[PDB]
Amino acid sequence: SLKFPKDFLWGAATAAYQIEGAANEDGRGPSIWDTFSHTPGKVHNGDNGDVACDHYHRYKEDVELMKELGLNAYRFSISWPRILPEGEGKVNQKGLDFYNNLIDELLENGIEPFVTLYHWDLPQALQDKGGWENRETVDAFAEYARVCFERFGDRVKYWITFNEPNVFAVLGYLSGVHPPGMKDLKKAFRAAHNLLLAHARAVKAYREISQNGQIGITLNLSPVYPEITDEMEILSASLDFIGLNYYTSNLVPPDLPRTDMGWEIYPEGLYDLLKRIHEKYNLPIYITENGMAVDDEVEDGAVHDTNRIDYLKEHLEAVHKAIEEGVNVRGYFVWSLMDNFEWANGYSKRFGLIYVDYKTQKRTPKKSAYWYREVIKSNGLE
Amino acid sequence: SLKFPKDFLWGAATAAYQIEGAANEDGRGPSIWDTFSHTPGKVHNGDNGDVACDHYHRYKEDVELMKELGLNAYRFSISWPRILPEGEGKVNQKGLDFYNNLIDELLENGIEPFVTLYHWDLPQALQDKGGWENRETVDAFAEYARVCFERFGDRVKYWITFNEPNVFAVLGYLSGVHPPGMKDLKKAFRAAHNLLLAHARAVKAYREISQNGQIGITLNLSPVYPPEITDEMEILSASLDFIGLNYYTSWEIYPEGLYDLLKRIHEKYNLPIYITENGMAVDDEVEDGAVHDTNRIDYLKEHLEAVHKAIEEGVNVRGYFVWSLMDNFEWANGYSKRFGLIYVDYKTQKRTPKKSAYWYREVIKSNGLELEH
């Protein structure tokens, strides 16, 4: 048996546009992914996030499923255009009411929020003026980050500025398979630069009103794909933790099994990566994403996804071997809590511990959900 | 009685985003008005054009209503993002199929198409790159105009480049009440400049394939709002075949203004003139299956008098189009302003001809009106 540290965080992760739905309800403005998934040829089978998991309306049931899972932490993202329909200025009280109710529901059931500010849903009004190529987007994000800290920070104490900014810059500005769908390295550089500045000014605004919580960033360090004043501002933004998203390693040759994404399953790469960061850097590490897509089928009311079981099992061995050698892994989040809209793959890729039937919105916990509940309860593995 | 020329065009007018619906169906990409109407605070009551009059699916019933009306011409717009979901590149075959079916349905009922290329629905993909502040949008519009000419021009003989480009530039870039919702005069200037260049490049592309149909543009010269020298001459190099006039008022009802303008265009310019828009919004209600919009009759009749006084003074008016054929999505006013000759109930999509439809039908049948001292 393999035990984890006592207060180790056990959670699952989602993202706003991937589960929320209610895209054009209750004062939410459109994001670039609303535009992207309404454009033919961009997303598998014309899927969009108009409805998604309808989590906006069904959050109470979803929080209750988290409690039965036994989570002590839940990673979600705030939809920027649900707070500021134009990215800045007018605030949506209804959007604030939703995340206040969500946060309070999580704490009522012993679940600690782990909130991501930007999870790729840039407000479309900002993209009309250039998006991340225009510095006024940086201003808007800082105002946006401020609003979230002031109204949610008394309850939220784990914050993330950006989810895989390195990946969005590549897929959105280099390969063009993600919005804003361009292929120009000079644009990618400018977008990346202002992403760093927006990160730094949000990190500083958090420290400037001083919450007992922490804030960091998340990166995937081996992903698989389908003037002067700014520099000083950027490097003065020291972190409290680093979030690691691991799925596979783009370097794998060894004949390995493959997921439903085509991704080779290679948990030892997680172990080494954890080691490499421990030697280079000393900050706390949270595995903010780790999961597997499976061709899941609801059977006789059940989904027997033992594939996903052994993937997470073998990856939770790798993290355990790392902590045994001093690496300060302080938490673990499965991607994902529920099947959802997986960007350009649409709904054809299921990562959830919980199956979602999109015709009925019925939630069916996968077998991995019942096994994960034991892992949290035992705080370890066999 | 006041009689019009034998070949005078009698029609009604619509615009793609205002009636079509099917906004995210059959290969259509989003327009800036899709984005605009999905943003809170931009459109009255949060209305949008997702469904509108569902004309995309109900076009054959609508064409049947046009023939009952007696129309010989019908002014509609082609949705640029229905032809090119991103404004340039891959062409949507289903979009070409729809307008081919529409035009063929019109001509089989003796109705002459009067097509507008740009009626305010810029593909959102091009707005992401700056929209009309970006010269690449000029290129995309030229290619767009070309595609339509090739696939539709063998049947279509009357073409409009832009509907009130002067109004869009003010409302989209100075006032900010229309998308892309900016308030900057220098941006209004640059957008205006690119619009004229795109107009000129499309006019010259039409002459390069030399279909002996006609090309022109539409302007409202009394709107209410309720140096690249090689460019500039390229603008002036784009001579017209006709001018389209949109008149509503100078909303004060003021038909004398119409006649005044018609002759000064006859004085100052000379092009054939089609009044491509004329109409009035009324608080229409269905009282037991009927709409008694006598107001709309008065407005039209009085304005049909002004055009008739101008024509017997030699003004070369060649056609007249009612705005609108049917109630529709009136931009930031949403569905709260009805301009149609035909009432549309948006819960059932049921079409109910108003009293003006029956009155306009007889005007066409008798090619004129009836007067008194």
Author numbering:
A (entry chain A): 8 to 233, 284 to 309, 322 to 451
B (entry chain B): 8 to 233, 283 to 306, 332 to 454
Manuscript excerpt for this entry:
Family 1 glycosidases (GH1) commonly function as β-glucosidases and β-galactosidases, although other activities are also found in the family. GH1 enzymes are present in the three domains of life and have been traced back to LUCA23. We focus on a putative ancestor of modern bacterial and eukaryotic enzymes and find a number of unusual properties that clearly differentiate the ancestor from the properties of its modern descendants. Unexpectedly, the ancestral glycosidase binds heme tightly at a well-defined site in the structure with concomitant allosteric increase in enzyme activity.
Furthermore, there is a large region missing in the electronic density map of the ancestral protein from X-ray crystallography, while the rest of the model agrees with a homology model based on modern glycosidase structures. At the achieved resolution of 2.5 Å, it should be possible to trace the course of a polypeptide chain in space, provided that such course is well defined. Therefore, the missing regions very likely correspond to regions of high flexibility. In addition, flexibility is also suggested by the B-factor values in regions that are present in the ancestral structure. That is, the missing regions in the X-ray structure match the high-flexibility regions in the molecular dynamics simulations and include the proteolysis cleavage sites determined by mass spectrometry. Overall, regions encompassing two alpha helices and several loops appear to be highly flexible or even unstructured in the ancestral glycosidase. The barrel core, however, remains structured and shows comparatively low conformational flexibility, which may explain the high thermal stability of the protein (see Discussion). The ancestral glycosidase is highly susceptible to proteolysis and degradation is already apparent after only a few minutes incubation at a low concentration of thermolysin (0.01 mg/mL). Overall, the comparatively low activity of the ancestral protein is likely linked to its conformational flexibility.
